[PDB]
Amino acid sequence: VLSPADKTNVKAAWGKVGAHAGEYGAEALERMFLSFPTTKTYFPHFDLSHGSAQVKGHGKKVADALTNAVAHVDDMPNALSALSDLHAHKLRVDPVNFKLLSHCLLVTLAAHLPAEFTPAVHASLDKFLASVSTVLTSKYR
Amino acid sequence: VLSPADKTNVKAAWGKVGAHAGEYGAEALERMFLSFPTTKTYFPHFDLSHGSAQVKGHGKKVADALTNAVAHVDDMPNALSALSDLHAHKLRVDPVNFKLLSHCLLVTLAAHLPAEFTPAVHASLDKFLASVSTVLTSKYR
Amino acid sequence: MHLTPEEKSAVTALWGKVNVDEVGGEALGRLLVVFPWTQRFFESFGDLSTPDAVMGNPKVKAHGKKVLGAFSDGLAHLDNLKGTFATLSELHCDKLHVDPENFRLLGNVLVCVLAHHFGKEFTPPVQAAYQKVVAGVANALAHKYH
Amino acid sequence: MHLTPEEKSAVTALWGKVNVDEVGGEALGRLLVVFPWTQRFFESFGDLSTPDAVMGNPKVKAHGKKVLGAFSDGLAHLDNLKGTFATLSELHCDKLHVDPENFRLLGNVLVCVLAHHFGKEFTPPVQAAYQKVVAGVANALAHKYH
Numbered sequence: 178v179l180s181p182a183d184k185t186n187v188k189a190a191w192g193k194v195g196a197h198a199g200e201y202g203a204e205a206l207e208r209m210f211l212s213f214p215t216t217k218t219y220f221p222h223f224d225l226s227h228g229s230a231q232v233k234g235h236g237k238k239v240a241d242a243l244t245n246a247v248a249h250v251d252d253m254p255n256a257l258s259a260l261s262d263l264h265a266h267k268l269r270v271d272p273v274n275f276k277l278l279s280h281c282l283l284v285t286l287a288a289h290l291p292a293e294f295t296p297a298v299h300a301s302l303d304k305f306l307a308s309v310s311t312v313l314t315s316k317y318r
Numbered sequence: 319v320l321s322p323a324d325k326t327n328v329k330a331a332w333g334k335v336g337a338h339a340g341e342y343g344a345e346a347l348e349r350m351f352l353s354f355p356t357t358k359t360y361f362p363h364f365d366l367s368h369g370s371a372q373v374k375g376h377g378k379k380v381a382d383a384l385t386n387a388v389a390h391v392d393d394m395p396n397a398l399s400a401l402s403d404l405h406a407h408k409l410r411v412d413p414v415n416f417k418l419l420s421h422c423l424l425v426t427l428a429a430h431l432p433a434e435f436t437p438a439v440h441a442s443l444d445k446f447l448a449s450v451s452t453v454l455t456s457k458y459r
Numbered sequence: 460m461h462l463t464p465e466e467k468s469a470v471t472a473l474w475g476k477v478n479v480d481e482v483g484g485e486a487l488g489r490l491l492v493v494f495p496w497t498q499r500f501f502e503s504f505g506d507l508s509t510p511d512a513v514m515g516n517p518k519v520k521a522h523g524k525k526v527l528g529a530f531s532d533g534l535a536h537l538d539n540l541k542g543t544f545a546t547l548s549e550l551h552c553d554k555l556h557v558d559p560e561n562f563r564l565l566g567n568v569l570v571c572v573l574a575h576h577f578g579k580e581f582t583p584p585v586q587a588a589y590q591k592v593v594a595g596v597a598n599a600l601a602h603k604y605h
Numbered sequence: 606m607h608l609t610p611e612e613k614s615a616v617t618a619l620w621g622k623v624n625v626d627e628v629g630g631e632a633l634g635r636l637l638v639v640f641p642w643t644q645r646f647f648e649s650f651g652d653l654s655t656p657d658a659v660m661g662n663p664k665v666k667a668h669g670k671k672v673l674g675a676f677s678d679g680l681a682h683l684d685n686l687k688g689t690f691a692t693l694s695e696l697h698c699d700k701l702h703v704d705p706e707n708f709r710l711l712g713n714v715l716v717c718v719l720a721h722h723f724g725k726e727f728t729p730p731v732q733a734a735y736q737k738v739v740a741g742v743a744n745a746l747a748h749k750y751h
C-alpha cells in the first residue's frame with residue numbers, strides 16, 4: 178500500500194510532469210518497443226515507426242490515465258475500474274508486460290526530472306506503478 | 319479475488335489432502351529444490367538431501383499454514399498477518415520465488431489427487447496459491 | 460539442451476508412454492481455463508465460456524494435438540531446439556502475434572498434465588528434467604522475435 | 606548477447622563518460638531503497654533505516670564501487686561474459702547465497718541511474734543496448750548456480 182509519504186512523492190513528481198505527460202507517455206512506449214520487442218505483439222495494428230502518430234496518440238491516452246490515478250490516489254480501484262475491465266476482457270495483455278511498461282516509464286521520468294528523481298521519489302513511483310498495474314490486472318480471473 | 323465456487327473447490331481439494339498435507343508439503347519443497355535450484359539460496363542452513371528431517375519438518379510447517387489459510391479463506395490477510403510479517407521483515411524472500419513453490423504444489427496435488435484435480439479445481443487452487451502469495455508479500459515495502 | 464544423458468533418458472522414456480492426442484487436448488484446454496486471457500487467440504474456436512465448454516471444444520482438442528505434435532518432434536532435436544523451431548518462431552511472431560510468455564504458461568500447464576497422468580512415475584527428478592525441456596522449448600520458440 | 610556492432614559501440618561510448626565510483630554507489634544505494642528486501646545481505650553495513658542512511662552509508666558506497674568495478678571489467682569482455690564472471694558466479698552461489706533475481710533488479714536500477722545521469726543522451730536505442738547488457742551480465746552471474 179501507498180503511505181502518505183508515497184502519495185506526496187507521487188503527486189509532487191507527477192506535478193512536475195505537467196503538460197509533458199503526453200510526450201513522456203509516447204516516449205515510454207517507444208523505449209518499451211525497442212527494449213522488449215515481445216510487447217509489440219499487442220500492437221500489430223499500429224505504425225510503430227519513430228514519430229508514429231498512433232504511438233503519440235496512444236502515449237497521451239496512457240498518460241491521461243496515469244494522471245487520473247494520481248488525481249484519485251485514494252480511490253484508484255474505482256477511478257480505474259473501466260480500464261481494469263477493458264484490459265481483463267478485451268485486450269487481455271499478459272500480466273508480465275505491465276512491469277515492462279512501468280520500467281520504461283521510470284526510465285523516462287528519470288531522464289526528464291533529474292532534480293526530482295531522488296531515491297525516495299524513485300521508490301514511491303515504483304510502488305505507485307506497481308499498484309496501477311495491480312488494479313489493471315485485478316479482474317483477469 | 320476468490321469466487322464462492324473457488325472457495326468451495328479449494329476446501330474440497332484440501333479436504334482430500336487430509337493427513338498427507340505434511341508429506342505433500344515436503345514433496346513440493348523437494349520438487350522446488352530440484353527444478354529451481356536458485357531457491358536453495360534461502361536454505362543454506364538446511365540439509366537439502368532427500369528425506370532430510372529439516373526438509374520434512376519445514377514441509378509440515380508450510381502445509382499447516384496452507385490449511386489455516388483454507389480455513390480462513392474469507393480472512394486470509396488476518397489469518398496470515400504474522401507470516402506476512404516474518405517474510406517481509408525477517409526472511410525477505412524475493413517475490414518471484416512464491417510462484418515457484420506454488421507451481422510445485424499444484425504438480426504435487428495433481429500427482430496425488432488424480433480424480434480431484436479437474437480443470438476447474440486446478441484453476442481455483444492456482445488463484446488461491448496466487449492470493450496466498452499476495453498476502454505473504456504485501457508488507458514487503 | 461543442458462540435459463544430462465540421464466536427464467535425456469528420463470524425458471525420452473516417459474514420453475514413450477504419452478498419448479499426444481489426449482495430453483495435447485488437456486494441456487491446451489487447461490491453459491484456456493486457468494489463464495483465461497490466453498483465449499484471446501482462439502475466438503474463432505467458439506464457446507469457451509466454461510471449463511466444460513473448453514474441455515469439450517473439438518477445435519481446442521485438435522489444436523492441442525497439433526501443438527504437442529510439433530513439441531513431440533522437437534524432443535528428437537533436443538540438441539538443437541533453436542534450429543528445429545526457427546520457422547515456427549517466425550510464424551508465431553510475424554503471423555500470429557503470440558506473446559512468448561504464453562509458451563511458458565503452456566509449459567507449466569504441460570508439466571501439471573504429466574504429473575496428473577503419471578502420478579507416482581512423475582518424480583521430482585523427472586519433473587526437473589521436464590522443466591528444463593519446457594523452458595528450452597519456450598526459448599527456442601521465442602528466439603526469432605524482433 | 607546479441608549486441609550488434611552499433612549496439613556495442615553505443616554501450617562503449619557512453620560507458621566512457623561514467624564515474625564508476627559514483628554510479629556504483631547510487632545504483633547499489635537505490636537498490637536497497639527501492640527493494641528493501643535486498644537489504645538482507647547487508648546487515649553488517651550498519652544503518653539502512655532511511656534513504657539518507659542508505660545513500661550516505663560509507664559501506665554501501667564502497668561496495669557499490671566494487672560491484673560496478675567488476676561490471677566495468679565485464680564490459681571489456683562482452684564476448685565472454687560467462688568466462689569473465691565464472692569465479693564470481695560461484696562465489697555468489699556457494700558462499701554468499703545470493704538469489705540471482707538480485708542481479709536483474711540491480712540491472713534495472715542501473716539503467717534508471719544511467720537515465721538519471723545522461724538525460725536525453727540515454728535514447729530509446731541506447732537503453733535497448735544496455736538492457737541486453739545488464740541481462741547478459743545477470744545471466745553470466747547466474748551460470749554457475751546449482
Ligand code: HEM
Nearest residue numbers: 216219220238239242243260268270274275278309310313
Ligand atoms: C499502467 C500501464 C497501462 C495503462 C495506464 C494503460 C492504459 C490504457 C489506455 C488508457 C488505453 C486506451 C483505451 C481506450 O481506447 O480508451 C489502453 C489501450 C491499450 N493498451 Fe493498455 N495500459 C497499460 C498497460 C498496457 C500494457 C503493458 C500493454 C501491452 C504491452 C497494453 C496494451 C494496450 C493495447 C493493445 C491497447 C489498445 C490500443 C488501441 O487499439 O488503440 N496496455 N491502455
Ligand code: HEM
Nearest residue numbers: 357360361379380383384409411415416419420450451454
Ligand atoms: C506458499 C507460500 C509460503 C508459505 C505458506 C510459507 C510458510 C512458511 C512457514 C509456515 C514458515 C515457518 C515459520 C516458523 O518457523 O514459525 C516459513 C519459513 C520460511 N520460509 Fe516461507 N512460506 C511460503 C513461501 C516461501 C518461499 C517461496 C520461500 C523461499 C524460496 C520461503 C522461505 C522460507 C524460509 C527460508 C523459511 C525459514 C526456514 C527456517 O529457517 O526454518 N517461504 N514459511
Ligand code: HEM
Nearest residue numbers: 497500501525526527529530547555557561562565596600
Ligand atoms: C509448445 C509450444 C507451441 C508449439 C510447439 C506450437 C506449435 C504450433 C503449430 C505447429 C501450429 C500450426 C500452424 C501452422 O503450421 O500453420 C501452431 C499454430 C498456432 N498456435 Fe502455436 N504452438 C505453441 C504454443 C502456442 C500457444 C501457447 C499459443 C496461444 C496460447 C499458440 C497459438 C497458436 C495459434 C493461434 C495458432 C494458429 C492456429 C490456427 O491457424 O487456427 N501457440 N502452433
Ligand code: HEM
Nearest residue numbers: 643646647671672673675676693701703707708711742746
Ligand atoms: C552486477 C552484479 C554484481 C557484481 C558484478 C558483483 C560483484 C561483486 C564483487 C566483485 C564482490 C567482492 C568479492 C569478494 O568478496 O571476494 C561482491 C561481493 C558481494 N556481493 Fe556481489 N556483485 C553483483 C551483484 C550483487 C547483488 C545485486 C547483491 C545483493 C543484492 C550482491 C551481494 C554481494 C555481497 C553480499 C557480497 C559480499 C560483501 C561483503 O564483503 O560482506 N552482489 N560482489
